[PDB]
Amino acid sequence: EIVLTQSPATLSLSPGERGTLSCRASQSVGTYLAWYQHKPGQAPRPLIYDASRRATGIPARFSGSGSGTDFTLTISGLEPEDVAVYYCQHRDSWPPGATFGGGTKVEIKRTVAAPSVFIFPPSDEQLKSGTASVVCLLNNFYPREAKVQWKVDNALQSGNSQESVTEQDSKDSTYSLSSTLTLSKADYEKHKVYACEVTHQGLSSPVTKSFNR
């Protein structure tokens, strides 16, 4: 019955930049609102209890405020180790279940970087085993938003590709992306031109990488 809505979905801050994260409740929750920091592969870390009280050992650059429905977490200046997903959380005594917001991803903001783009045909070895995977690599780009579309003899592919994105790079704050198009060997042999179309704001025009089977 309580829903917590967090915004923005992603908050992009230059190192040292101040940022504010919002958490709004669907009805008043008083000051029963906590904030956690979460990084992949470790437990959520308590930051703020009861809307404004800092948890043990939490640096002063984190501050919580608000009451009722509207809450904020302020980071007075991003440090690199602050890159994480932040969740707000509510609970009361009865009924006793906790509710979490959907999370705000905090990332480092940097200058735009266009991806280098590479396409890989399936190996003869893989073809031997009846499947064909075509791989498209977008290397070291920023910001994270990118579009990859597969075309086979100019036909837009749908439902037969999957993609994966790395966590933000610890050295240059970019992202990388892999898209894999998967076809049966039979289907693969029925066409000639395999193309990856990549759209990114760092590119003046979308880039097409292609090969003849």
Binding site: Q42, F118, S164
Partner: protein, 225 residues
């Protein structure tokens, strides 16, 4: 103070796992206890609670009737018995302690101590090692430019696989991607590296792939075709 978490594993749908947490450095029986989870691609989700003295419990609708929370205030442990498991129960599970009162200003409605997290994977897939295929650098690769090469690590179960390059000697420019779960129920990932195209004239590139669950060890050299 700590919650020391154990349990977890990989099971078929409809089967069972038990998670446990042992209290350390605080008075276990003085505090309500919770389980929280995070499914791949999703946020934190509250799962269940048991009161300090085990007399009241409560469940998320998504697990009610299937999961049983319990505690042992003699052994000072917390348990989650997970029966009738579904693929969508696949997640990292955390035990969590209720925050402390402090003489009026502090509520017990946050979570101040968390278990490290343990993975529960529910799938009809069975253990399978990956095939490792080369992602050869383009024939168009030429000095002054950047070349990409890699290995496709396809059709394995369960997570994880580890990938290194040149037995750990190559790290600069390496990207090993999050695995993707295919409709077959098997995982696939790629590991790539970008290098100066010039280096293709002198340097050997070998991807070292390990999938412990299947005892699969593969070292694949990747060269221009």
């Amino acid at each position: 103070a700590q919650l020391v978490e154990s349990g977890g594993g990989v099971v078929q749908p409809g089967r069972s796992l038990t998670l446990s947490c042992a209290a350390s450095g605080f008075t276990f029986s003085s505090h309500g206890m919770h389980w929280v989870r995070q499914a791949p691609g999703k946020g934190l989700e509250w799962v269940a609670v048991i009161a300090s003295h085990g007399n009241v419990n409560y469940y998320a609708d998504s697990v009610k009737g299937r999961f049983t929370i319990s505690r042992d205030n003699s052994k000072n442990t917390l348990s989650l018995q997970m029966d009738s498991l579904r693929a969508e129960d696949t997640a990292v599970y955390y035990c969590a302690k209720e925050s402390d009162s402090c003489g009026g200003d502090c509520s017990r409605f946050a979570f101040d101590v968390w278990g490290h997290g343990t993975m529960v994977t529910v799938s009809s897939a069975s253990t399978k090692g990956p095939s490792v295929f080369p992602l050869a650098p383009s024939s168009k690769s030429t000095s002054g430019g950047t070349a990409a090469l890699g290995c496709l690590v396809k059709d394995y179960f369960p997570e994880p696989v580890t990938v290194s390059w040149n037995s750990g000697a190559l790290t600069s420019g390496v990207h090993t991607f999050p695995a993707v779960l295919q409709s077959s129920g098997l995982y696939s990932l790629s590991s790539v590296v970008t290098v100066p195209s010039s280096s293709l004239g002198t340097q050997t590139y070998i991807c070292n792939v390990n999938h412990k669950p299947s005892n699969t060890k593969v070292d694949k050299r990747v060269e221009p075709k």
